Amino acid sequence: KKLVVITGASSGIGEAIARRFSEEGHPLLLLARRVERLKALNLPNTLCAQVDVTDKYTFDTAITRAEKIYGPADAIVNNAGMMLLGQIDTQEANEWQRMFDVNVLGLLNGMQAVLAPMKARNCGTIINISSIAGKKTFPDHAAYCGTKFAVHAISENVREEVAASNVRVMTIAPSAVKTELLSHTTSQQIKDGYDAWRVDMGGVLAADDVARAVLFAYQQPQNVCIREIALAPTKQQP
Amino acid sequence: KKLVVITGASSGIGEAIARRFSEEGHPLLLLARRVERLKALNLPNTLCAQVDVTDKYTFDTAITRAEKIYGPADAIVNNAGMMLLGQIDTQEANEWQRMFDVNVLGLLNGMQAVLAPMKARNCGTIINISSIAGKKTFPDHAAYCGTKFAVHAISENVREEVAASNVRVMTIAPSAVKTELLSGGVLAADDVARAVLFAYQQPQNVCIREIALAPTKQ
Amino acid sequence: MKKLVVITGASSGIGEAIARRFSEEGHPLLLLARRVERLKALNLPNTLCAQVDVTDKYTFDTAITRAEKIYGPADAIVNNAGMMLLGQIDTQEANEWQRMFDVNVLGLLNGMQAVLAPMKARNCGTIINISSIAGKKTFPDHAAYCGTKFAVHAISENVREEVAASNVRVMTIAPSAVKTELLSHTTSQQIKDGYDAWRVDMGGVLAADDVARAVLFAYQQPQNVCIREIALAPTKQQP
Amino acid sequence: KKLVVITGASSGIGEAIARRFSEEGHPLLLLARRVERLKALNLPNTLCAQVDVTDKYTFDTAITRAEKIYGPADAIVNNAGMMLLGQIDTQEANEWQRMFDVNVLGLLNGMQAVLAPMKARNCGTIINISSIAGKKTFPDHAAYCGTKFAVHAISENVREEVAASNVRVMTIAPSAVKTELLSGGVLAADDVARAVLFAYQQPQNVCIREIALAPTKQ
Numbered sequence: 001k002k003l004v005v006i007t008g009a010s011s012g013i014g015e016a017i018a019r020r021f022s023e024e025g026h027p028l029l030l031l032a033r034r035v036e037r038l039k040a041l042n043l044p045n046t047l048c049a050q051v052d053v054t055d056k057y058t059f060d061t062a063i064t065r066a067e068k069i070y071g072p073a074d075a076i077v078n079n080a081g082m083m084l085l086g087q088i089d090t091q092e093a094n095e096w097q098r099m100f101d102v103n104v105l106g107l108l109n110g111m112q113a114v115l116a117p118m119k120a121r122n123c124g125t126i127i128n129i130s131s132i133a134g135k136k137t138f139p140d141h142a143a144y145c146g147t148k149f150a151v152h153a154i155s156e157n158v159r160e161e162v163a164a165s166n167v168r169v170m171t172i173a174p175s176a177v178k179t180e181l182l183s184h185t186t187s188q189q190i191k192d193g194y195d196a197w198r199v200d201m202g203g204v205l206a207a208d209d210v211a212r213a214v215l216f217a218y219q220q221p222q223n224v225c226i227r228e229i230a231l232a233p234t235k236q237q238p
Numbered sequence: 239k240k241l242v243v244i245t246g247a248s249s250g251i252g253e254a255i256a257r258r259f260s261e262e263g264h265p266l267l268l269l270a271r272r273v274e275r276l277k278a279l280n281l282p283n284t285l286c287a288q289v290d291v292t293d294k295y296t297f298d299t300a301i302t303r304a305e306k307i308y309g310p311a312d313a314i315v316n317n318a319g320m321m322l323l324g325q326i327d328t329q330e331a332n333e334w335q336r337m338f339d340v341n342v343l344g345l346l347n348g349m350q351a352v353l354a355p356m357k358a359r360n361c362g363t364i365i366n367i368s369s370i371a372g373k374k375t376f377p378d379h380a381a382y383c384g385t386k387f388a389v390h391a392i393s394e395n396v397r398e399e400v401a402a403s404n405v406r407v408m409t410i411a412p413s414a415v416k417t418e419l420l421s422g423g424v425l426a427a428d429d430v431a432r433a434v435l436f437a438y439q440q441p442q443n444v445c446i447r448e449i450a451l452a453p454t455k456q
Numbered sequence: 457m458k459k460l461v462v463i464t465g466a467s468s469g470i471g472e473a474i475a476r477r478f479s480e481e482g483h484p485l486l487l488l489a490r491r492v493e494r495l496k497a498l499n500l501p502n503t504l505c506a507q508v509d510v511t512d513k514y515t516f517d518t519a520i521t522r523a524e525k526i527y528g529p530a531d532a533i534v535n536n537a538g539m540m541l542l543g544q545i546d547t548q549e550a551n552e553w554q555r556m557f558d559v560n561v562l563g564l565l566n567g568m569q570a571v572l573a574p575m576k577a578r579n580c581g582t583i584i585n586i587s588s589i590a591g592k593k594t595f596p597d598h599a600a601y602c603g604t605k606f607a608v609h610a611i612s613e614n615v616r617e618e619v620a621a622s623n624v625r626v627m628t629i630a631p632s633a634v635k636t637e638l639l640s641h642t643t644s645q646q647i648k649d650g651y652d653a654w655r656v657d658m659g660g661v662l663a664a665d666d667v668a669r670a671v672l673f674a675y676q677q678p679q680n681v682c683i684r685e686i687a688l689a690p691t692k693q694q695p
Numbered sequence: 696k697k698l699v700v701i702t703g704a705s706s707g708i709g710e711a712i713a714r715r716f717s718e719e720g721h722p723l724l725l726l727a728r729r730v731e732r733l734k735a736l737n738l739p740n741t742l743c744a745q746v747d748v749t750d751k752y753t754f755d756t757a758i759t760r761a762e763k764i765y766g767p768a769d770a771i772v773n774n775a776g777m778m779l780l781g782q783i784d785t786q787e788a789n790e791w792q793r794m795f796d797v798n799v800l801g802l803l804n805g806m807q808a809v810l811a812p813m814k815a816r817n818c819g820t821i822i823n824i825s826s827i828a829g830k831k832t833f834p835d836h837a838a839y840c841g842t843k844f845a846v847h848a849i850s851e852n853v854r855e856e857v858a859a860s861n862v863r864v865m866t867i868a869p870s871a872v873k874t875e876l877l878s879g880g881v882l883a884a885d886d887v888a889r890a891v892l893f894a895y896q897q898p899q900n901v902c903i904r905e906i907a908l909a910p911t912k913q
């Protein structure tokens with residue numbers, strides 16, 4: 001079965017997606033900075049590389065040396081990302097830079113790594129992990145919403161342009177998923193408010209709920225393109 | 239397994255959805271005006287009624303009658319819809335009236351038929367067939383795009399309002415599906431149906447709010 | 457003598473305010489509403505008043521023909537007539553959805569069709585549709601009204617693209633929270649009370665004239681400049 | 696009248712906005728890299744500073760210096776931006792980096808420069824120049840559309856968060872304006888400038904949240 005590359009596989013949604021794709025029999029390339037946590041997953045058929053997705057050169061290289069083993073990447077899941085919440089009046093400006101670097105430029109690196117080849121052979125699937133925050137706004141999310149709307153726009157724009165080469169581009173837009181994400185935010189008060197929101201919801205999506213949707217989209221015949229799947233706990237409100 | 243109601247099941251997308259839900263073992267209420275094509279699907283455990291979704295009384299009664307046989311509907315697929323194309327400057331105005339009546343009002347009727355009881359048991363799934371024309375405009379499609387943008391907004395609004403009752407509201411947005419609507423960048427009706435089923439089959443606490451799908455090409 | 461402007465829903469609220477501004481600019485007007493006496497009590501110069509229900513297309517069309525005999529071709533129509541019937545979909549009277557879609561959508565489509573072929577032929581004219589930020593965003597108790605207003609947004613954009621080459625303009629004006637008669641038509645006294653407390657709580661709300669100034673500004677741009685959308689709301693508006 | 700800060704004022708839209716605000720009697724701070732084009736505008740009561748908007752320190756300092764002279768900024772126009780077109784499969788990645796840095800981070804820098812003081816005053820207006828490319832995708836524009844969609848979201852989000860402080864946040868979305876971007880059917884820069892001025896000049900309690908404009912034709 002065809003190689004699948006997944007960024008940010010070391011926890012959360014990416015870990016869950018790796019498990020499902022492995023279990024379907026795909027050989028994998030998993031990319032994250034915490035490369036030993038990747039190894040501790042113990043998946044069959046399964047190259048782990050220590051890669052920062054904002055390092056285009058290391059990124060592309062890892063990919064090339066994985067395709068020397070498993071053939072052309074038929075899919076990349078651009079999943080690596082971070083959420084640094086804050087108010088624009090006070091938030092540390094370097095938090096904006098880091099988020100846009102991973103959530104947007106990292107993802108663009110991911111797309112460019114595979115897009116030329118996929119177009120040439122008329123096959124392949126780009127799956128970008130956006131968010132319902134790419135669709136609407138949320139308190140303290142200004143810069144993060146910025147990255148996710150950009151991801152939404154980038155995805156739709158590329159999808160239109162590679163349609164004729166029979167390449168698929170997919171946007172997966174989760175909300176409220178139990179992962180490490182919220183823990184990177186700077187303000188303890190924001191994290192507390194967020195955690196109570198999810199508690200009050202009756203809890204929240206499991207990473208695997210996103211993973212099953214990602215795999216379902218991918219497993220459709222090449223000629224069927226699920227452009228978008230948006231998902232959230234049923235009880236999610238404001 | 240629980241009753242599922244499907245409007246517009248006499249061809250195309252709604253037929254293909256009926257087939258997938260039936261194969262999965264759900265008893266069905268199939269609603270449409272050509273009841274004889276419904277009968278001809280010859281699906282097991284499937285009630286066929288002649289109902290125009292704009293006729294609220296006949297619609298409600300069909301559902302009540304069906305829930306007596308197989309118990310309360312756990313999903314309704316609002317799929318009945320029609321596409322009348324034209325330029326606003328010349329299009330016959332009754333076409334607008336009829337399209338909004340079927341595509342929007344009919345859909346509202348279906349939602350109101352199940353919403354109160356679903357909220358009361360804290361379970362239920364409403365699945366609305368919108369369109370990629372409910373997210374973007376197209377030449378000749380003005381009034382039709384209108385109905386589908388209406389469906390998107392109504393679905394979003396209602397979803398927010400029933401979330402606290404554990405009731406799911408899902409929008410399915412296909413494009414370029416081979417069906418009777420007009421009457422390899424085309425979709426099979428069954429491409430839509432697998433997505434509708436996949437969404438319904440998630441645990442009750444997981445709501446796939448939207449799936450938009452189209453042929454890779456075109 | 458400037459060009460004729462047609463305005464629907466001119467008997468109160470936003471439509472009345474829009475009529476005053478256009479009258480002040482020296483446009484002769486045709487004003488259309490069901491309360492034709494309130495129209496007449498506006499006392500505007502160069503102003504034809506006609507008792508028209510915009511869901512009655514034949515009367516609608518006719519009223520327009522009769523005004524163009526006097527003042528020449530309508531250079532603008534403001535499709536402003538509308539109503540907002542708020543409610544929960546599980547309990548709202550279904551006939552409220554029908555009435556609201558008939559005025560807010562079909563009414564407005566009637567208005568567009570009255571002028572569009574002629575405007576396209578002479579390569580001039582402006583269609584101004586009053587949508588709402590509820591045409592962009594959802595709001596508690598607004599399900600059906602949001603439906604009408606998203607439909608208005610979609611219809612406007614679609615028609616705008618199609619008549620672009622004929623140099624006709626189609627504009628969407630999307631207000632929120634304007635002091636008018638609108639909210640008073642809603643059925644539930646509970647909803648009305650909650651809504652009114654919301655507008656009080658934000659510090660009050662737009663004046664009708666705030667919308668009218670934006671409409672006039674968009675229209676007064678040269679014919680080759682198309683302001684496609686203006687969205688506006690009290691500054692202090694939030695959830 | 697009150698100080699207005701305008702970024703990207705050395706050509707195109709930003710120049711046209713500067714002229715309209717100056718003619719209306721506002722003292723200005725003009726920021727851009729070609730300081731000598733700024734000086735060459737020769738506008739009354741107008742400070743010209745050489746600032747790259749991505750250079751946060753120089754940006755903030757320029758504003759502080761200007762507010763000593765003419766008082767606190769009542770508006771900032773975040774207009775500095777650049778458009779590097781390409782297909783994602785071949786585009787030089789540094790073009791993405793720099794577009795986002797200028798079009799998004801530059802704009803965030805400008806917002807953070809005035810936000811807290813405006814909140815404290817309960818007055819002020821932030822005006823962000825987006826695009827119809829921030830509402831709509833276009834061939835060859837993927838990364839650029841990305842930046843403008845980001846600008847739309849950021850603007851909407853910040854508007855909701857500062858509304859309670861009586862601070863206005865407005866997005867102007869033009870299309871096809873005759874400028875240097877690209878280095879009928881076409882808008883003059885002054886078409887944008889009149890809309891920007893009209894929005895600012897409404898009473899403080901009236902927030903024109905968005906204006907999208909384009910040539911009627913093409």
Ligand SMILES: NC(=O)C1=CN([C@@H]2O[C@H](COP(=O)(O)OP(=O)(O)OC[C@H]3O[C@@H](n4cnc5c(N)ncnc54)[C@H](OP(=O)(O)O)[C@@H]3O)[C@@H](O)[C@H]2O)C=CC1
Pocket residue numbers: 007008009010011012013014031032033034035051052053054079080081082083102106129130131132173174175176177178179180181182
């Ligand atoms: N959780 C939620 O509620 C939602 C999440 N999302 C999106 O899901 C995606 C995954 O996040 P989630 O699993 O939730 O959060 P986690 O923090 O659990 O996972 C983030 C993943 O990205 C990796 N990563 C971060 N920075 C880099 C980098 N520079 N280079 C390579 N890898 C990096 C991390 O690995 P390592 O640090 O080892 O490099 C980790 O594997 C993100 O894009 C997030 O925005 C969208 C909507 C909702």
Ligand SMILES: NC(=O)C1=CN([C@@H]2O[C@H](COP(=O)(O)OP(=O)(O)OC[C@H]3O[C@@H](n4cnc5c(N)ncnc54)[C@H](OP(=O)(O)O)[C@@H]3O)[C@@H](O)[C@H]2O)C=CC1
Pocket residue numbers: 245246247248249250251252269270271272273289290291292317318319320321340344367368369370371411412413414415416417418419420
């Ligand atoms: N085909 C495509 O490419 C796309 C389709 N869609 C949507 O898919 C949905 C199904 O249409 P599609 O399968 O394409 O076209 P079809 O015409 O094949 O299906 C139409 C179904 O709707 C039923 N129907 C029509 N009017 C009524 C009514 N008044 N009361 C009850 N049932 C009615 C018809 O049955 P009967 O006449 O017997 O009553 C028929 O069963 C529609 O809502 C359509 O807008 C969305 C995007 C794309």
Ligand SMILES: NC(=O)C1=CN([C@@H]2O[C@H](COP(=O)(O)OP(=O)(O)OC[C@H]3O[C@@H](n4cnc5c(N)ncnc54)[C@H](OP(=O)(O)O)[C@@H]3O)[C@@H](O)[C@H]2O)C=CC1
Pocket residue numbers: 464465466467468469470471488489490491492508509510511536537538539540559563586587588589630631632633634635636637638639
């Ligand atoms: N007020 C607000 O907060 C907002 C309003 N809007 C839109 O503004 C527009 C005007 O409403 P607004 O001024 O607020 O409310 P009002 O109720 O004050 O005005 C409604 C106008 O429409 C007329 N009208 C209603 N039905 C018909 C009909 N069937 N035929 C002809 N005319 C009709 C009414 O006149 P008569 O009964 O005499 O016929 C009245 O002049 C509406 O489309 C509304 O949706 C958008 C966003 C916000």
Ligand SMILES: NC(=O)C1=CN([C@@H]2O[C@H](COP(=O)(O)OP(=O)(O)OC[C@H]3O[C@@H](n4cnc5c(N)ncnc54)[C@H](OP(=O)(O)O)[C@@H]3O)[C@@H](O)[C@H]2O)C=CC1
Pocket residue numbers: 702703704705706707708709726727728729730746747748749774775776777778797824825826827828868869870871872873874875876877
């Ligand atoms: N032109 C069009 O059709 C449309 C334009 N827009 C937006 O309008 C805004 C203005 O661009 P437009 O007038 O068209 O094009 P111009 O190139 O004429 O204007 C660009 C302005 O931005 C300044 N600028 C660029 N980079 C920086 C920087 N790093 N720091 C400070 N200033 C900078 C440039 O000055 P200098 O080099 O001296 O630093 C110049 O003054 C842009 O954000 C653009 O995206 C949106 C839709 C359509």
